[model samples]
Target: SGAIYVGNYRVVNRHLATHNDWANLVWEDSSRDLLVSSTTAQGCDTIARCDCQTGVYYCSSRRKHYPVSFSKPSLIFVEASEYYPARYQSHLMLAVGHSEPGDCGGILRCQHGVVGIVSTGGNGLVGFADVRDLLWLDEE
Candidate 1:
């Protein structure tokens, strides 16, 4: 002789909704203490912060209206003033990404702080040239 057993199961649909809720929560928390804009001479109108952890900044469409254009193979020149002497000559980091017509962004780390970001033009190789007086350059 065998005994028969009966059971029931219920399906829940809140998992995805809960996951999205948590995802939004995490994103909001992570982005709260980030640096949204640059506080330098270039002005916020021309520069924008893409990621704060890596100190990344990009040139927006508004800033690329006139003489400046952020595109492939562009060149960015950075200069640090005496007031911010610690950032005079430091490691300039660059990242090239394909976002809304391909763009490049960089961060200038001086002493222990980020000085400025590199701007890009349309179709040009991006690089850095060390300048002592901000007036000397090598002939290419």
Candidate 2:
């Protein structure tokens, strides 16, 4: 889940994560902390308590390498008076049955943390980019 205060705009100075199917943008705003799933954000900035290490887990525990997705529903603020999880499927996370193609770029949130960013809309679904892997992408 992602957010920015109303009547304000955040900035993304760099694309720390850019890949074939997902990406993450970043900027400096320490006043409010967002849910980060990695220990470090590559070279862009250090994510506080970066813990979700996708595909690189080498420990002896049974804990999954990917971020443990929460079933909590997510929300997005697209409509002027409306809003909308870690919802996932084959490749992208899912959204409840009410989405528009114009909802692209809207941040999907679970409570206070970001789950994904809107990528596209289709038959009864709003596909979004999962931020875990992308959030940890190297800036270079």
Candidate 3:
């Protein structure tokens, strides 16, 4: 599912079922998947996968207070079932960006791919490992 926000500061992360954050919705493909940039609460940049395929678009929550700076997100999501095989507790691979900016005055932004996993009510956030490039064993 998805939604729309024009000049709306969407949640970069959620703190608690519900680890979902999103921002900027635009249909990037008429043939392939529509592209949207959702930086998680943990700052995990994610793309939408459902168009005319699995689900539709709609807005649900709201939390916005920033100049779109890169801060640690409190909640992020990775539905293992949505991708290739071995979907369960999974590592989150983030496309790092903006830990630095020219106007931000030489601040270091972004980081290596994050490695962590979570569940609803059970033990959450385990083995939060950091890896180099496209290399993480538990991620699939």
Candidate 4:
């Protein structure tokens, strides 16, 4: 559930249902310093459920334009999810690489651990949130 972009410019934050209401900031792309909304227009129902670690894996998504276009034959999803897995160890979790405006909310796994959640991207860098912090409140 996320905002769908138009040619990497316009944002279609509305849903097909007339009463669905305008989109609100449901997700945060701290990497791009932007907020994202959920829409029934696109995205998947399943979400990654696993602990995260500091390592390399793949960042895959069926997103729209920007970074590249989406097509059936092109079927290229991973932008090397680890564009620089170790280079961005300075901050919370920011990687230097190419992602898409529509690719937000994807998961960034480290080998077997689901390390981060894809949130923002631009300028050869992508930002993600630590999954640990996201589920910290899960325990009673």
Candidate 5:
């Protein structure tokens, strides 16, 4: 195994789902936090910062991105990861199945205090009781 660096996107797992023009544009990391795998579809890219030593995670997506264009009802293949440096550098983090969304935006959280979510919809912090709470209860 590779040494856990301070800032880098580690592939914890992967996910697959069908996304549309207004399908929330979200995906979860290994923690299974209700999240968006990437922001490529939302017309942007993403970057997150987390310090394991401090146990603090802050993620932000770039705004003012160019518009979006998809081939109606596309399938999304997600590469879940944990980033300590910044997702901004992880250009492929939010990449689509065919190609990059050509933009940036989106994020997910874990058990660490302030476990939250920030995606195409918006950004927010959550202090859920159980880990499952952060995950999607239903496919709807």
Candidate 6:
């Protein structure tokens, strides 16, 4: 149900096997433009900026050789499911923070209203979808 990253600089995007294709990570550039992709081979793993004012989209991937950090509000939307009706459908938004201070630490965020903080050094956040749970529609 989840993918873990080895020491190889590959960030695995985790999700249910039925839904193999998922893009839950976003990387921003110096222009403050948001670039998101699920393919880890594309070098889309590095946090270049942290200015939430311009919008926190592009943080770095853990594979980068240099230090990277991100401090931004990430929004996750989940559609209705069997447990919840159509009218009850809703999305969850989370504020992510990095304690690494530089680029080596990793990504840490509140687990869907849970008080606990989940941290991953190599693999970034995954499973931002709505099929079995919710789909990660867009990142801004």
Best by lDDT: 4
Q: Give TM-scores for every candidate, taking all chains together and pairing residue i with residue i.
A: 0.20, 0.34, 0.16, 0.38, 0.18, 0.19
Compared to the true structure, candidate 5 yields what TM-score? Answer: 0.18
Better of 3 and 6 by lDDT: 6
lDDT of 1 by residue, 1-140 (tens): 00001011111111112343344331111111111211112221212222222322333433441122222222334332222222222323234432222222233223323223342222332221111111111110
| Tens-digit lDDT string for candidate 2 (32-77) | 1122222222222221223221211111122222223322223432
lDDT of each: 0.23, 0.32, 0.20, 0.37, 0.23, 0.24
Q: Model 4: residues >4 Å from true position, as ranges?
A: 1-53, 56-92, 135-140
Better of 1 and 4 by TM-score: 4
Candidate 2: segments with Cα more than 4 A from true spot: 1-91, 135-140
lDDT for each residue of candidate 6 in 1-140, tens digit (9 for 90 to 100): 12222222223222121222323343212111122234444332232222221122223443322222332334433233322222321122223333121231222222121111112221232211111121231122
True-structure lDDT of candidate 2: 0.32
RMSD of each: 23.1, 14.6, 16.4, 12.3, 17.0, 15.8
Number of colliding residue pairs in model 3 = 10
Model 3: how far is 113 from its true place, Å?
A: 22
Clash pairs (backbone) in predicted model 1 = 72-124, 73-124, 73-125, 74-124
Q: How many residue pairs clash in each candidate?
A: 4, 10, 10, 1, 14, 17
- Badly placed stretches (over 4 Å) of model 5 are 1-60, 83-140
Best by TM-score: 4
